[PDB]
Amino acid sequence: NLYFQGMATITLERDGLQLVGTREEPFGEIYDMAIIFHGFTANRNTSLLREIANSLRDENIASVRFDFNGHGDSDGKFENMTVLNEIEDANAILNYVKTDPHVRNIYLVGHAQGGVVASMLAGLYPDLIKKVVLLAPAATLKGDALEGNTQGVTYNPDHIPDRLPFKDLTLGGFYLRIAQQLPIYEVSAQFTKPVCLIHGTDDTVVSPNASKKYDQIYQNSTLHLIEGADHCFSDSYQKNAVNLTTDFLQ
Amino acid sequence: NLYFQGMATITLERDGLQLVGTREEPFGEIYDMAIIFHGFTANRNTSLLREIANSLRDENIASVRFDFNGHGDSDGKFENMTVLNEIEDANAILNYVKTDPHVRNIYLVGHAQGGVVASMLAGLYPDLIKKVVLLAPAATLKGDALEGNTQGVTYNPDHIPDRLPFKDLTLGGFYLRIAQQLPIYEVSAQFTKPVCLIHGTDDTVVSPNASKKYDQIYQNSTLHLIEGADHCFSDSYQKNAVNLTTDFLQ
Ligand SMILES: CCOC(=O)/C=C/c1ccc(O)c(OC)c1
Ligand SMILES: CCOC(=O)/C=C/c1ccc(O)c(OC)c1
Ligand SMILES: [Cl-]
Ligand SMILES: [Cl-]
Ligand SMILES: [Cl-]
Ligand SMILES: [Cl-]
Ligand SMILES: [N+]
Ligand SMILES: [N+]
Ligand SMILES: [N+]
Ligand SMILES: [N+]
Ligand SMILES: [N+]
Ligand SMILES: [N+]
Ligand SMILES: [N+]
Ligand SMILES: [N+]
Ligand SMILES: [N+]
Ligand SMILES: [N+]
Ligand SMILES: [N+]
Ligand SMILES: [N+]
Ligand SMILES: [N+]
Ligand SMILES: [N+]
Ligand SMILES: [N+]
Ligand SMILES: [N+]
């Protein structure tokens, strides 16, 4: 605002879970605010999401970035996380933003699974969200679940176990059952305002096809396929992903 | 079990919320178990649900019945309840039931909004649940949210407010935005094992067309129209409701 600029730690509640975020507070009385969503097994402070927030703040656009339930500093077990209770988290954060009287327009920015959270959130709030940016949005998480292969890790898609080991973590059977029947496109397509879609052509975690499908379902989308970029927009592509996002929001 | 029979109060957790229930434990080393789900604004101990759990226990079918979040003895504000978070409540209860070693077949039994919870849960666990009984399932709550008229309380369905004063209660805006888009029949229709559908013909809260519709989506359903019954299967209608429920779960 006019008196404090820079970062602050903010905590919210969603059903007796506490969610821990970082607010990037710009100069100015009135401003636009982006809610930024990290991906699966990630947290609010990846390089991509840090640089996103920072670039946004340099253009006077506020932001908040939170750890989803079961990730980062936020409460709850990873095994109990699903895309749906992430939407619930995202709604608790949308409550916080929409009641700050500094905020003018609200933007949603999500990477990977946080892109699916963003796109379905905007589809529930198409009357409130103004612009949305999706980076490598992971709608393919639904097909992976129908196939029985989530990021290497395999199961029978018709006999899903109670839990699945997944690196050093424990993934919940319910995550996968919800994943198989997520109405991603059905919900996301309710949002008819400006969408920015950024995806790397060398993404091997989430097919570019995912962004090509989002480009079909939105009537107001712009698609950027970044030649050579990976899933994380690593190395030289990160600045590319970050300027696209910033440019679009202004 | 073979040593203890009779009731107990169970406490479960879901996302930092305590869910309070009643477990009825029958005779035998091995038995089937019913999960009984109450409706919108109701609780686990309505006359109807006590009588279901009693009739079941006479057949040595075990049951549990929990207050959903925002109801009865359970945690959370009513205004923060949604059908989605009730499904998550329901999944937490299912975790408890499915991990009991005495339990053979798991049945779902849901009244009104508890019917929607039940049908959706069965659709997500079509490999685990053995049988479903829906009493006046409120699948009409979605169309009601799309029209903008929930039990006579009207609001703009394209501009859903933050909160809706709702007769001595305050229903959450996010309840309504979820309801509009819940994929009730899509998910429910994945359950291809036996379903028993029961609806009174004089229900004025949930149109009988709801049970008619399920009986069309389902690959193995049986429809019981109770001539003259009300939404809550009151007085004489209750024993008919209960017997149909009991006989079916056998
Ligand atoms: C941080 C980047 O990673 C993601 O967000 C991935 C989302 C996602 C992609 C494919 C899947 O099969 C899946 O189910 C676990 C999730
Ligand atoms: C306690 C017994 O009854 C119920 O569960 C009723 C549920 C219900 C019916 C129609 C609706 O438009 C609705 O939106 C909140 C909810
Ligand atoms: Cl699970
Ligand atoms: Cl015994
Ligand atoms: Cl009663
Ligand atoms: Cl009967
Ligand atoms: N200010
Ligand atoms: N985030
Ligand atoms: N399978
Ligand atoms: N969307
Ligand atoms: N588009
Ligand atoms: N036993
Ligand atoms: N309910
Ligand atoms: N109530
Ligand atoms: N009751
Ligand atoms: N009931
Ligand atoms: N409430
Ligand atoms: N609510
Ligand atoms: N009603
Ligand atoms: N509003
Ligand atoms: N709400
Ligand atoms: N939907």
Residue numbers in the entry:
A (entry chain A), B (entry chain B): -5 to 244
Question: What did the published study say regarding this structure?
Answer:
The structure showed a canonical α/β fold characteristic of esterases, and the enzyme is dimeric. Two classical serine esterase motifs (GlyXSerXGly) can be recognized from the amino acid sequence, and the structure revealed that the catalytic triad of the enzyme is formed by Ser106, His225, and Asp197, while the other motif is non-functional.
The Ser106Ala-ethyl ferulate complex crystallized in two forms (Form I and Form II with a dimer and a single chain in the asymmetric units, respectively). The root mean square deviation (RMSD) values of 244 Cα atoms of both chains of Form I onto Form II are 0.25 and 0.3 Å, respectively, and the dimer from Form II is essentially identical to the Form I dimer. In all three complexes, the substrates in the catalytic groove were oriented with the aromatic acyl moiety of the carbonyl group bound in the deepest part of the pocket. The opposite end of the ligands, on the far side of the ester moiety, such as the ethoxyl group of ethyl ferulate, rests on a more solvent-exposed area of the groove and has few interactions with the protein. In addition, there was relatively poor density for the alkoxyl group, perhaps due to the lack of direct interaction with the catalytic pocket.
